[PDB]
Amino acid sequence: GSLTEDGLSYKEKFVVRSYEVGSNKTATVETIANLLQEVGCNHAQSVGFSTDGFATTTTMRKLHLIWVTARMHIEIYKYPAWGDVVEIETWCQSEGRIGTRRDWILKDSVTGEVTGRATSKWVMMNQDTRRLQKVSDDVRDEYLVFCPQEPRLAFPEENNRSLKKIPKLEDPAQYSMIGLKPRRADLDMNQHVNNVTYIGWVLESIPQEIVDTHELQVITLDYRRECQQDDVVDSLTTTTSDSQFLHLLRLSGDGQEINRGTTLWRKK
Amino acid sequence: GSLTEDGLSYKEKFVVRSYEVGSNKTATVETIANLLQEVGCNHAQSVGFSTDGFATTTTMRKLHLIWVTARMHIEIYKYPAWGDVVEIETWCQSEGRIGTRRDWILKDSVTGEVTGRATSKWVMMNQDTRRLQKVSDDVRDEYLVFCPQEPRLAFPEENNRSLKKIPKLEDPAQYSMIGLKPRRADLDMNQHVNNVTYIGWVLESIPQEIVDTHELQVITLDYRRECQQDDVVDSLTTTTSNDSQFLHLLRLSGDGQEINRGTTLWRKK
Ligand SMILES: COCC(=O)NCc1ccccc1
Ligand SMILES: COCC(=O)NCc1ccccc1
C-alpha cells in the first residue's frame, strides 16, 4: 500500500483469500470490514501514528486519550470473488470538536469500477474513565495536515443513509441469536473485542433463508458500549419492510445496549 | 504465489495484518494456520484441482469423494510481527492407500531463516455417507505427478512429535470452556466449519495466565468428527507436565461425542 501523489489519501490492493469467502464464493461483509480496518491502520502508520493505539499521538498517550468508532456505514454493489484483486482508497477528514470521519472507496482492480463505499465516525475518549472528550486544538492540529481541506465525501448526498437516526428495537424481537461470546481470535492486540466481530454478531440473527436468497447491500451500525472479553451478547432482529431489518445487540443478563443498526438486502 | 522451478512445490509470501496479531503484536497460531490453508488452496488451484471441493478431481466429484484432514501438527520457533513478511513453502506426498501428507516450511522473508514447520495427514471419504475409503489407483495417479518421488519431510526425525498417539482426556478436566458455538464467519464456502476454528476452540480452555506468560511452541490436533453449524462444543484441558504441556479434548456439549483431541507444548517467555 501507499500514500497517493498528494499525500492526502492512501491506497492498497488485496487478493481475496479462500477462507475469506461465503457460500457464493465471494467475500463476506466481515472480510470487507477487516480490509477497511487494515487499510485504515496502514494509512495511520504511513504518517507516524502510534503502533500501540490507533490514530493516537505522544500527546494523546500522555493524557490516556484514544479514538473510538461511534458509527460504521458500508454499501456494497459487488462482492469480490476468491482470487480477485480489490483496490481500496481511504482518507480522513475533521468534523470539528465532535471528532473525525474516515471514508473508503472500493474498486475492482481490473475494470476500475467502484464496487463499494464506506464511511465511519470517530469520537475521542479517555481510555480509563471511558468519558467522551472534546478534541482540543493541540490534538486537532496534529492530524489536520494529513487530511484534505475541501470536503471529500464517500456519501455526498444531502441527507443520505449514512446519517439517518437509528431507533431502538422493541421487544419481542422477530428473530434472535443468544449466548454469543467472543473467543481469543475476536480480540485485538490490546485485548479489546475487534470492531468487526460486532458486525458478525448483528448478522447472526438474520435467518438463513434471507442469507441464502439475498445479498447484503447496506449496513449501518452504532457503537454505544464495548463488549468485555467475559461478557455474553444477544443479537436481536425485526423486519421493517428489497428487505430491511432493525438490529439490537445487548448484554445477555441486564439487557444493557452495546450496538444498534439497520441492514438492507437485495434479492439475488 | 507460484510453483517452484521443478513444479513439485509452491511458495507464497504474506504481509502480517493488524487484526492478525495477538497481545505480543505477533501473529496468532490461528493466523498461521489460516495462511497454511491459503497456500495449500493456492497450490491445488495452480495445478487444476477443483474450486468447489479442496483437492478433488472430475473423477472424485462424480463419485462424491472428498479429502478430509485427519491430523494437523504445527511447530513455531518465531511468530512474525505485524508488518513482517513470511514466506511459506508447501508440498504434498502420497502415503499409500491410507491417504496423503501435506507439509509446510515457514521462513522469515528478510533473513531466510526457518521460523516454523507443519505437517498434515489427509484421508479420503464419501461426502454423503461420511465413510472413509482407501484411495484407488485412478485417483492416486491423478495427483502423483504433482508430488516429489523422493521422501521430502518437514519433520524427518524417525520417532518425532508429529506421529505420537494422543490419549483421551479423563474427567474431571482441570480447565474447561463450555457452550462454544460457530458463527457464519467460522464456516467455509461449503457451509462446513473451517478447520482453523477447531484450533481456536481447543485453545479457549488454556488459562489466560498461561497465554500471558508463555508462547505456544507445538500443537498436534486429531480430527475425529465434524462439528455441524448448529452443534455446541465443550473444550477441555488438563496439564500433563521450564515447559508446560497440556492434553486437550473437544466434544459435543450434550452427549459428549468426541470431535477432536490434541496436545500443546508451551515455552516460558
Ligand atoms: C483500528 O481500526 C481502524 C479503522 O479504520 N477501522 C475501520 C472499522 C471501524 C468499525 C468497524 C469496522 C471497521
Ligand atoms: C481517529 O481518526 C481517524 C483516523 O484515521 N485518524 C488518523 C489519521 C488521520 C489522517 C490520516 C491518517 C491517519
Ligand SMILES: COCC(=O)NCc1ccccc1
Ligand atoms: C482446505 O484446506 C487446505 C489446507 O491445506 N489446509 C491445511 C489445514 C488443515 C487443518 C488445519 C489448518 C489448516
Ligand SMILES: COCC(=O)NCc1ccccc1
Ligand atoms: C489431499 O491431499 C492434499 C493435497 O493438497 N492434495 C492436492 C495436491 C497435491 C499435489 C500438489 C498440489 C495439490
